[PDB]
Amino acid sequence: SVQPNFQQDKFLGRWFSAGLASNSSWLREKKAALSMCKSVVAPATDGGLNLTSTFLRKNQCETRTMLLQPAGSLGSYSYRSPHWGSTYSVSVVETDYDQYALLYSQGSKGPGEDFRMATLYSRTQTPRAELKEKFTAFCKAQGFTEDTIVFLPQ
Structure with a gap:
């Protein structure tokens, strides 16, 4: 299931990863x-998205970029993970662009192949009760x- 009439350009910018769920214990x-990490979403050369996440380790802000390739309908992507020898389907299931994305x-x-994960993106670091x-x-x-x-704290 993909967000109807998905507008990729309105999905760009700064988001905070505010919760996740997964069948992988160690990932959770x-x-x-x-904790909550900042993500920056920007258009990629291939028509999909670059998703840049930052997190703190010790005295350092580490940066990671994931290329989400278009997978044939707007709002769905594929991500290839060389380290895990795997490819993943990523869908923007629901978003209002200005507050949240699921x-x-x-x-x-x-x-x-067996991996699954739901992710909550919020435009702010303090998602409202209703979004949680x-x-x-x-x-x-x-x-x-x-x-x-799991809700990720700020």
Whole structure:
């Protein structure tokens, strides 16, 4: 399921990763340890997106960029992970552009085929109660149990 009439240009800019859910234990625990991270979304040369995330380690702001390649309909992408020998489908399931986006990622090829993750993006570092509830309900609809749902603190 993809956001109808998806406007990629309105999805650009600064977002904060405010929650996630996944069937991968270690990803949930690590992302929890990192806290909310800033993401910057910019158009890529191939018509898709560059997603640049930053996180703090020790005295340092580390930068990571993921190329989300267009996968055939607006709002859906594919991400190739050389380190994990795998390719993943990434969809913007729902967004209002100015406050939130709900994303869903699953493995599509390689050993990470089984992987699944729901992600909450907010335009601010303090998502409102109603958006946290939306996200919990989104995760539940995607089969994630409440124990796999994690809100990332600022």
